[PDB]
User: Which sequence fits this backbone?
């Protein structure tokens, strides 16, 4: 009774201590595990985010509210200008304009020992976009900026004449983001942007972090473009289902008309306001792989001019911190681990498997 | 002589090349190795550090030193006010008060397209703490701050009347830290804090890093609560054995009386001063697992009022960088490595071990 | 035919599926792979970068250009002063001086509850260096700075008398770097430096990152000292090969004379200007292992004085990020993987190899 019974016991022990661990290794593979590798990549040419600069929100704007109060309207019912033959929705939104046509931007990438800074005026020029904050100015910042030392920046200058006639602005909402995601400019500039003064010139410094997520089956990516498409589609469709008025405001894509009547424009504005606060929760689409983080510090550097808005965005660090999460347990790893845990507990190794198969086939 | 001698040589070689490497694998396990994995966790609700705001140290107060110089005392012998019927120890700390009773704090977490910033006035309100710097104001900042965009901050406002009668302050000592560690507020605020001006409103921006240490046998954690308990107990006990006067000052826990006499209050104050400089070296307790680093940038944003202290702490980055060091060589790993290095050099694998055991038992 | 052929096929299959994977493992070792491990090391004593503070470039000096315009020359031909008996090249470069002899630096490392800040005036004092920007001041910052709280900084003060006689400066070029690399001071201060105002006292905060590269055969290091020697030798030799004038300017090492004539000094200046822009590309030597990154934030703190230049550099974070890339595939790893992949597909394990060797030797 001793010999073969003990052999059976000691062989089933090994079989069950190998099958359990093979199941654990294959059960640790179905649940995609991800580990983050971080790197500091030195950039020769940096990818400038494309800036949107806005006035403060309509009620906080110092220029828009001036006309609104001059027409008998208050900082609340500013959408009451629409029920007026001389004021349509576009006109009311051209009132918030604080950026004269002389707005421009240049790239200062490098410095000379003789000349000074290297000025490159001919690059992506700003254009006028309509945003929940009003009529804003969008800076495409499309071409890559060659990194030459800490004095590698972009200067946005609006040289308008402050010939005192009417009250003029006090601060601007800056927003750094990516391109063709036309909901970042037109919906989320008044939420994600920095409210900074334009009384005197100011400077930013942007460091870049890049978080890359794994497109694993239990948490799928979409890519920035599809994420923006989904987010904007949800934002607009929810705004329409919530306002229950088939029309739109200047910050929305021209799907349908502008309803030049205050009552159903207030509905659209309120629906936008209460739909853009919570769309990360209520939108059924998922994390971008590439998430770009713009660590924006403020620089007390030396340059003063006599112009309305003098903005500088510095890119003085070419080392981008990239944190990428990757599948730490592949199929090759799983198969090798099964082979090791089965050859450590049984000793049969593929070749023995082939020999056994040949014996079975005789 | 050739055959079995060569067999013996070639088997002892394998045995000694396997035993040495198994010893090295088990000798690399006793010395706990730790590897750091870093992650960037996106926070939906951020954990504000609970701020302590102090006046500058007694001799640098522009208010305390005023009365001290008005009483015939100088900013040095300021503890000589205590040998007077009208001045106790607590009155001297009450003289450093620069925060009127109207001090308050609110949470601005989000922004509207219509209303503007979302104001939440009812949160953890400041209370009066006694510190080595004088009578300070402590922001409990307990409730988590829901993160809406970059414009997620807490505003601390002290709207007192600057009706010019006496000279009024110029700077304040800010200190961001954690809760119930009542030595951070009352001992180390004048050491670890930022000395910033209150001439005009200022804004802070806090990014969070979290360093997690492994509680390995040769470098044990204590956890933040136990660390604070040990540090405060050591600080106070050392202060007492160094001052050799059985009494305490307003910043100390009420273990015993206040010794209302300048001679032994100066001893306590000097002992505190020279004991809080070097307590990391002289305290026999160990690194917290969670070390919370508050990268505090200064944020030239747009908001000015007409109040004495108008401070803003911004939380514009929800991505917390967590660097956790973990045991990179576990017992499962050790056993698997021993099995691999012994099955690679001998070929015997558990199952063969059980077979040999059965053969020995017959 | 049947069973012999099947055995042949099933053994060649294992042999060719093991040889291919062993080749892939050895082909994954020749191409040195590197993985980055990141740590946050807490420093007790921090390593200050040794600062070079310069006036703005010659044509942007408001003092140098003053004398240049006062001598009938303009701020374009400032090198025409050399064609004058009273002006040599050294004198023309002593004109850019904006730092009186009273320039000094001290280390404020800690704070007292009684005294205040711990002032250590006797440290590495600044010395007068010649740089492409003019006559600059170099702060050796040699001794390590004991880190005591966030109020651990170095104050550089130039207490000169502003007795209004001639126009006085308004900006300075700061540059944080390492030591004995005498091309950082003398060539690249006007390129890598921050141009900051000296109208009122300002403060920097430096956080250190350290990127360590692996000295792999396909991308070798040189070490900071050899890298600096290579860069400076290339810069100077290229400047001479491009100017085609055998002479040098004050910022150059005293290899040969100063050629006090405007025509062949302008050539040297222009060659320097157009050679230091692009020397990373054109220099045939490679990345330092240790790359030190000085994340410089601007710090709005409270310390104002009545002196010309009052600079503070704060070191409020002792936790240094260190990202080291290491060879993730060593020879031990390669050999162990080969042994595992041939013991998993064949079952031969070293000892079997010795047995086969003995059998062959008989």
Assistant:
């Amino acid at each position: 009774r001793w010999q073969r019974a003990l052999w059976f016991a000691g062989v089933v022990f090994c079989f069950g201590i190998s099958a359990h661990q093979i199941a654990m290794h294959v059960l640790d593979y179905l649940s995609e595990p991800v580990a983050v590798r971080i790197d500091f990549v030195a950039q020769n040419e940096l990818r400038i985010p494309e800036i949107t600069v806005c006035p403060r929100i309509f009620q906080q704007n110092t220029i828009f509210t001036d006309m609104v109060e001059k027409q008998g309207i208050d900082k609340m019912k500013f959408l009451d200008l629409i029920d007026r033959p001389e004021y349509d929705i576009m006109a009311v939104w051209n009132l918030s304009r604080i950026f004269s046509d002389n707005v421009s931007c240049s790239a200062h990438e490098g410095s000379s020992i003789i000349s000074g800074s290297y000025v490159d005026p001919n690059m992506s020029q700003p254009h006028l976009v309509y945003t929940t904050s009003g009529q804003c100015i969008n800076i495409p910042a499309s071409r890559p900026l060659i990194y030459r030392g800490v004095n590698t920046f972009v200067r946005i200058t609006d040289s308008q004449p402050r010939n005192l006639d009417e009250v003029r602005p006090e601060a601007i909402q800056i927003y750094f983001h990516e391109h063709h995601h036309a909901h970042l400019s037109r919906y989320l500039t008044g939420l994600r942007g920095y409210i900074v003064p334009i009384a005197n010139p100011f400077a930013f410094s942007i460091r870049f972090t890049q978080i890359n997520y794994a497109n694993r089956t239990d948490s799928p990516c979409v890519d920035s473009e599809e994420y923006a498409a989904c987010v904007e589609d949800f934002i607009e469709q929810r705004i329409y289902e919530k306002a229950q008025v088939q029309c739109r405001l200047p910050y929305m894509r021209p799907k349908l008309p502008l309803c030049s009547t205050p009552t159903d424009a207030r509905k659209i504005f309120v629906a936008t306001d209460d739909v853009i606060q919570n769309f990360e929760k209520e939108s059924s689409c998922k994390r971008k792989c590439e998430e770009n983080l713009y660590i924006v510090e403020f620089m007390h550097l030396f340059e003063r001019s006599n112009i309305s808005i003098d903005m500088s965005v510095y890119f003085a660090y070419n080392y981008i911190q990239v944190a990428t999460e990757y599948l730490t347990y592949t199929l090759r790893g799983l198969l090798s681990d099964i082979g090791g845990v089965l050859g450590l507990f049984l000793g049969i190794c593929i070749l023995s498997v082939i020999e056994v198969f040949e014996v079975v086939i005789f």
Remarks:
- Chain C is about 30% helix and 25% strand.
- Chain C touches chain A through 51 residues (CB under 8 Å).
